[model samples]
Target chain A: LEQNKDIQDLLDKIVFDAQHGQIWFDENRMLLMHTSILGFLRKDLYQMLGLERTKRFFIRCGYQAGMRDAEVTSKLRPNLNEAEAFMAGPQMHGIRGMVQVEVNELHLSHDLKQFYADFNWLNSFEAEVHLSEFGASDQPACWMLLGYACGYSSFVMGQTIIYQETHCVAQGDEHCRIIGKPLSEWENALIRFMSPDAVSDEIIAL
Target chain B: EQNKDIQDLLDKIVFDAQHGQIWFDENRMLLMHTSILGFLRKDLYQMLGLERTKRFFIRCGYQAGMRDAEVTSKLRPNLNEAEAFMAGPQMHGIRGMVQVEVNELHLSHDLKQFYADFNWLNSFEAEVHLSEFGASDQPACWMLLGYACGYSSFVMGQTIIYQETHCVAQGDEHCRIIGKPLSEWDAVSDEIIALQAEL
Candidate 1:
């Protein structure tokens, strides 16, 4: 609601769908339907986006999570001043035993084996967060991440495209980032998931 | 190359008793045995069954441990079982020659260190701090493995529990294994798993 028009429609879809309703984004091209709603309409949605995918789908696919988180942080905490005090705010001993932040910025490079999500601490405790994985075999936190990315994007885009959790990555890539791409890039992703014949075969002289 | 992922530590810490202090509540021991034997004990009236459609997550942990042990052995290369376990969270607060006891949970930080330190420590690195701690949901969900059993035993008027230590800060999603005992499951998952640590 703070930034983008197209995204606002999308956010409406998340709340609507989460409440067991369906809202079409075809007019806006950012459909936000619940798994149940999608299931009633497109039987394949559940098959394609099973439980894991369904849970993380909107949070990541919508792509507004980050922007929304940024807005929230800026409004409530402002400047990085409140971050140290609330640094681990939603993530630790108080509840989730660890809070999830927007990851505001990351300094990933090919030269390094590890990546750091430039975080803003707003809590009392200080942590370098040395471990990057949940366990030796577990993946990193995705839900808190979903909220962070979704909040940030929701604000930046001035709409409601959130990022949920997603899996299925090439070998070394455990999973993609907690953010989603803009609608403009959906074509490529759609191509990957859909059969090519589904695309219109317009003959052209190249 | 110090290797900066949580797995880097788990790979060797689990088996190296010298690297950690492993605590075992009777319920925790039962949880391990139950999981090892298959879903003969996982309860359904709790969050431990989050979004799970199948009847086997505890088994998944076993599979993870079994397969991961080889990686742990390979990466550790030199440390013995006791050594790696000692490097883990189990021994974090243990002290004395025959103390063989678990201590209360206390976290700390060094402001500039990669890890937060606790009571008893044995890291081969100088980057360890005993002050960094997390107060989120992850740590709570994470402690379930051990807390559940402790509570299960407590409901039956028995005592069983344990605590884990993490080398990473809560700001990031990195952590390692550490276990200990509990009095009862009161407000703590009622104590079955207490639901502490990075959930």
Candidate 2:
């Protein structure tokens, strides 16, 4: 670390650094609102766009936000090995009050050829707010958090990756859980679920 | 539209803020939901009496509506005044408190009238007993009414006001409210004007 340009730039933008070990800054640049609004939008999306489109909407939301974080951490903490960098995403989640992530299982090849990661989230902001507002949903509802997992992993490995919510608190589960892998290993149909026409053609018909 | 198209539109990276946060809206604003009831019941109403508390929230809504009005003028130029003004009730629904749907819109040239019906599935007002925040013969969705008025007035370039004709608190079937310009509801205009004046 001769002089970590990435970390310096990040720290430069930070104000009142390390107040209660919480790096504070203006959220004006990156909008952070309460989860209730997201839950509200999630309901409307499901109603207006249908379940399939809504799920993709949330997954993509999480994905973009996760990718943004990946770029920052991978550059600044270049010394982090694969496991350390991978763990950074969850750590960042806790910082944002999005969820408390706990990894239950992990397997990563040194060559980066294959990977599997599964985790559980307690007090998941999305699931909690969704449950509070809309009550129990028929399926797991922590869509955006799942998207973030895939996005960060994809950026870390330089390949397309996807994560799906296996269990969720909003659906009456104890917590939210996610399973993720590189895109190609999954079945074609499962992969197609995230495609553009998954719900759009039906919407057009309506 | 394809999922790719949705992703391109919804997931396109606008700008990254500090701490790896991002927004879909170019101005760093994104649709969100939060428990206003929790805040109103637990915090604000307890701190300020009902009248002052109402004023505070009304001012808050006014500023929010003004911001949206500005954005509608600049960014969403294609939208008509009615479309531009709908953002207020939409904001209420967007926050996950209540689902405020526009059942009718009559943005008359002078009258500027509209009717919005709200379903309070998880309205914080519904959870608490009237004894907690005091009882009211009319609707207790003060913030909702505030937002409707504030948003309408800002978008229409005239002071518009709303009064709840029905309320869940009063054991009504569902929350219903109507919005009209000051002249349209002259009888209650003084009282509504006084509320805005406090802010």
Candidate 3:
């Protein structure tokens, strides 16, 4: 087994403790879940609210978890640079068992300019588990992972960073790959709506 | 002037668009959907029986309430006790778990009391209903009760407890929770501890 310090550290620190009578991961206050349960929920969501609405909902859920992880990492490791901070998202992916993320290309600059990164996932839990239960999807089904990447990258950049599913296992690709860029660089209306910042607009309206 | 500060405090919410995060920095809090909470709740019942689950969540809520009180004291100590106490319900509303409008509030130092009729919209208990599990006979908003009890106790610097007098889970039209100092209730004082025995 090759060495991954981050994964080793996270695994070692998994503390199971109770609050009142409930068990939780002490570091993150997160609980473990079977990937199947997530797929089941996703299946129910698709059945309840067709494809578009379900995708939006999954994106929202992914976005929230991503932003939360960003906030947590920044607070815990204040000294982490923009690149290091951005890596927190990928590290979180491995920790959550959603995917095994490996960096393909990364260009993080201090000026917050020239920000782009490519991530490839091997044995992606989201796509693989989904395919195991349901079969190949017409489009990328890793909505949550994509949302998380967008959220985490945007958080680190101090501006919006949008990620696109260039290759997805759910799409019959050999491996799942995502390419991220600054939100301004992309003119896609769908990506614009998917930005984590859109959520803020709703709260303000409320 | 006091109400104005409270309202301002309410208005200062920071909603992060990229990650769908709601931050109340002044109070040092974050808001999330009730379904997020429901996920943990389901796990608790699975790992521990219903009785222990209740104790665990209530205790967690109690602790959270106390911690929020401490933060409130440090951040906005100048606010009168009444306004300070409203933070809990306002927080619930901010998170979209419920819309809390104070029906009556008395933060008198001698007899600190709080009562807020809740329009429990998007309640996690209700969110998990039928979809994840069946209906609950008792009040299902354990965390809410925990928070109310915890916040009141810490703000008053005494042991305060709360119970859901009416809940949507019980098929009520809406949810209402009443909070009082521990002395106000009888056997209910030992309700949480007695949970283990029931199991």
Candidate 4:
């Protein structure tokens, strides 16, 4: 139940420029939108693009977002050590009103190659919204959040880091539990869908 | 121009850090990535053709605008009809959609004649489009246009259609739109027809 002071610092950086119609966290621009709109988008995109493509879309979106945040973190907290700096990603996850991330276990090497982490996600907006609209699912429903985690970690580590949800609240679990490691550590990594070419049949043929 | 009313609408947004949530009055809000929106826009255009993508975003914006209009009804009861109608634009600004200025507005008391000219500066949609795909041949403010239509139509108790005559994404100085009652337009575009289609 320990709190990261970085999270509070991130929260303090939120700026609302009413006159200009902008919301920002430090130098990053953010949008204040209804959570349900995201739900609608997920459902609509799923219906329009099917399951695999929709997942790819969200993952790509989240990966780009993660890279942006990583750059912001580097600029804002340049003095912090590598591990402390990495914590900013999880802290930002909460500041962006996405999820409450509790780091259960973490290990990061100084070379930024080896990485392993365990986390418990509380009050996942993705899970709640998905359950409300589509009921409990057989698969993990936190697509964007997963992508965010993967993207953030990957950018910070400068290596392809992937996260897998071992337990998901969207599948009737009490809480969502996730584990992260280098991409090569996982047998079937989800990062294959991070590229637009991944879903293209042309790429498969080539 | 004055910004007191717009400031009032912006005051409704509350950020709760302990719960990791945002709120606009009683509605739950989320802090979304602006870049992700830009990426999603490009993806939609690439996956679904241009027409289908425009229709999809316009419909989404229409529903959002109608919902916000309903919320505005409860928030502003003291202002007159015209003054209250401006809430829709202000809300759009507060939500990080765009900064709106009503250049000219002519509304008859009988609700028969309705014409509004707006200038949208720093439009998020247009900025996203320009960043993603550069300049376009046509106006690129589909969602914002749809929002104006939905909000005005709900307030006026009749169908309203908005057209973006100028857009920054199309190399204009900024985004400008003119809106009127549905019947006034001689030739309706596919956007208007998209609104009429069932979701």
Q: Score the docking of each candidate (DockQ).
A: 0.01, 0.04, 0.02, 0.49
lDDT of 2 by residue, A1-206 (tens): 32434234344543421111112322212222334345645665567667777666666666656766777667555575677657767766655557767789877654756778888887676776577767888987777777677667777777666666778889888888887776677664356434423322221121
**What TM-score against the true fold does each predicted structure earn?**
0.27, 0.46, 0.49, 0.86
A76-104 in candidate 4: lDDT tens per residue? Answer: 66677677778888777776677878889
Model 3, DockQ value? 0.02
Estimate, for each residue in A115-140, the C-alpha lDDT of model 3 and write its tens digit: 88888876566786568757888878
The TM-score leader among the candidates is: 4
Candidate with maximal DockQ: 4
Candidates 3 and 4 compared: the better one by DockQ is: 4
Cα shift from native, residue B169, model 1 (Å): 20
- Cα displacement (Å) at residue A193, model 2: 17
| Cα error, candidate 2, residue B21 (Å) | 15
Alpha-carbon runs more than 4 Å astray in model 1: A1-151, A161-206, B1-68, B75-80, B90-199
Best prediction by lDDT: 4
Measured with C-alpha atoms, the lDDT of residue B75 in candidate 1 is 48
Q: What is the TM-score of chain B alone in each candidate?
A: 0.25, 0.66, 0.74, 0.88
Per-model fnat list: 0.00, 0.02, 0.00, 0.51
Q: Candidate 4 chain A, which ten residues in sequence have the lowest lDDT sum?
A: A197-206
Residue A15, candidate 1: alpha-carbon lDDT: 20
> Which portions of model 2 show Cα errors greater than 4 Å?
A1-28, A187-206, B1-199
Per-residue error at A200 for model 4, in Å? 14
Clashing residue pairs for model 4: none
> Model 2, B1-199: lDDT tens per residue?
3332123223432423222233324333332212223333444455445655555444544555555445444533575766555555444443334556556777743544544444444343443435354455556666456556666776676777776766777777767776766776512234564644442
